[PDB]
Motif scaffolding. Sequence first.
Motif, PDB file in Angstrom:
ATOM      1  N   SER A 123      35.094  53.349  32.191  1.00  0.00           N
ATOM      2  CA  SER A 123      34.163  52.313  32.618  1.00  0.00           C
ATOM      3  C   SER A 123      34.827  51.275  33.506  1.00  0.00           C
ATOM      4  N   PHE A 124      36.105  50.992  33.284  1.00  0.00           N
ATOM      5  CA  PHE A 124      36.814  49.950  34.022  1.00  0.00           C
ATOM      6  C   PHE A 124      38.151  50.499  34.495  1.00  0.00           C
ATOM      7  N   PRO A 125      38.192  51.097  35.684  1.00  0.00           N
ATOM      8  CA  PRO A 125      39.479  51.550  36.219  1.00  0.00           C
ATOM      9  C   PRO A 125      40.410  50.412  36.560  1.00  0.00           C
ATOM     10  N   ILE A 126      39.878  49.261  36.949  1.00  0.00           N
ATOM     11  CA  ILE A 126      40.678  48.054  37.115  1.00  0.00           C
ATOM     12  C   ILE A 126      39.760  46.864  36.881  1.00  0.00           C
ATOM     13  N   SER A 127      40.290  45.824  36.247  1.00  0.00           N
ATOM     14  CA  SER A 127      39.471  44.663  35.965  1.00  0.00           C
ATOM     15  C   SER A 127      39.203  43.879  37.240  1.00  0.00           C
ATOM     16  N   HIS A 128      38.158  43.055  37.190  1.00  0.00           N
ATOM     17  CA  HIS A 128      37.762  42.311  38.375  1.00  0.00           C
ATOM     18  C   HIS A 128      38.743  41.195  38.690  1.00  0.00           C
ATOM     19  N   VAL A 129      39.356  40.610  37.664  1.00  0.00           N
ATOM     20  CA  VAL A 129      40.185  39.430  37.873  1.00  0.00           C
ATOM     21  C   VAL A 129      41.510  39.807  38.529  1.00  0.00           C
ATOM     22  N   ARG A 130      42.089  40.943  38.148  1.00  0.00           N
ATOM     23  CA  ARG A 130      43.306  41.393  38.806  1.00  0.00           C
ATOM     24  C   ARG A 130      43.033  41.894  40.215  1.00  0.00           C
TER      25      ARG A 130
END
Lengths: 51, 51
Positions: A17-24
């Motif tokens: 669902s989250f390959p990379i977080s939005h904040v990083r």
Amino acid sequence: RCNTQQPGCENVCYDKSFPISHVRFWVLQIIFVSVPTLLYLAHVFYVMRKE
Amino acid sequence: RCNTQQPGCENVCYDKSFPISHVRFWVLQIIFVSVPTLLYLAHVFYVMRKE
């Protein structure tokens, strides 16, 4: 939270669902768009030295 | 047992699989099979009592 009992399904489903977080992603975006300006300083401390 | 966390999922997913059990099916079979023999048996007793 997932609706199952199979062990480890939460980890792989969160990874998909989250390959990379939005904040990083936004941190990398802030880093990558600032460094084009630094070469401008590489001009200035050049030419003042020549002056 | 079923592989879920939803409450009540086991009760319906068991009931769809087994609308009747086999041991209650075979009792219903073996009673219906032996009804006419005991019917004939009790009939012959009354006919013999009449004569």
